[PDB]
DNA sequence: CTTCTTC
């Protein structure tokens, strides 16, 4: 009856291995276990300088509203891009960019690379002023006017791209990226667009961070 | 996994 057969026994021949060792890693964590010595340093100086102004608990809920404010923003964009939200400062801030968005092909949709073996969750694949791109919407309290102000956002964007131009669940491909940074006070958002060549150069930088991850784990 | 925090 069975049509494809593999052997139960191996013709070649206190373990307590955890389940997650074999899970396909995610795009974000691959990046978080590959941060530079200076990047981990700069963020920790920020956490400890924070907790001193707000106490161990005040910061703990400062973290809660940042995450939630992000949450509601993405719930807002899914309602507006599924085929009072206009009083949100973040939506006030993206309203101009958002009128440039049509042809939505995916919202909050998971992506998997079979050969490169990582997963991710794309914000949205839509047309922005005609160019079909992977879009990453992001909240921020400080302005991020240049793309190098967004830190690792370029590399996750290109990580979502090249992984979804091979994910079998997508018939189409994409060759551009867009990071949109929305601010709480309502001032206009900063679009950071990434044409095909600039996604190519970050894609190179992302393949380096993927090798660091596979290295650090194999010994560990 | 995300949602963010470095500059």
Author numbering: 96 to 108, 120 to 189, 199 to 335
Paste lines from the article:
MGME1 (also known as DDK1) is a highly conserved, mitochondria-specific DNase. Human MGME1 (HsMGME1) protein is composed of 344 amino acids and belongs to the PD-(D/E)XK nuclease superfamily.
Via the GGATCC located at the 5′-end, DNA3 can form a 6-bp duplex with a 12-nt overhang on the 3′-ends of both strands. The HsMGME1-DNA3 crystal belongs to the C2 space group and contains four HsMGME1 molecules per asymmetric unit. DNA duplexes normally adopt a B-form conformation, however, unlike the regular DNA duplexes, the DNA3 duplex is severely distorted. Though the flanking G1′ and A3′ still form Watson–Crick-like pairing with C6 and T4 of the complementary strand, G2′ does not form regular Watson-Crick pairing with C5. Phe173 is located in the middle of the α3 helix and its side chain stacks against the A3′-T4 pair of DNA3. The weaker G1′–C6 pair and the irregular G2′–C5 pair all indicate that DNA3 is unwound to some extent.
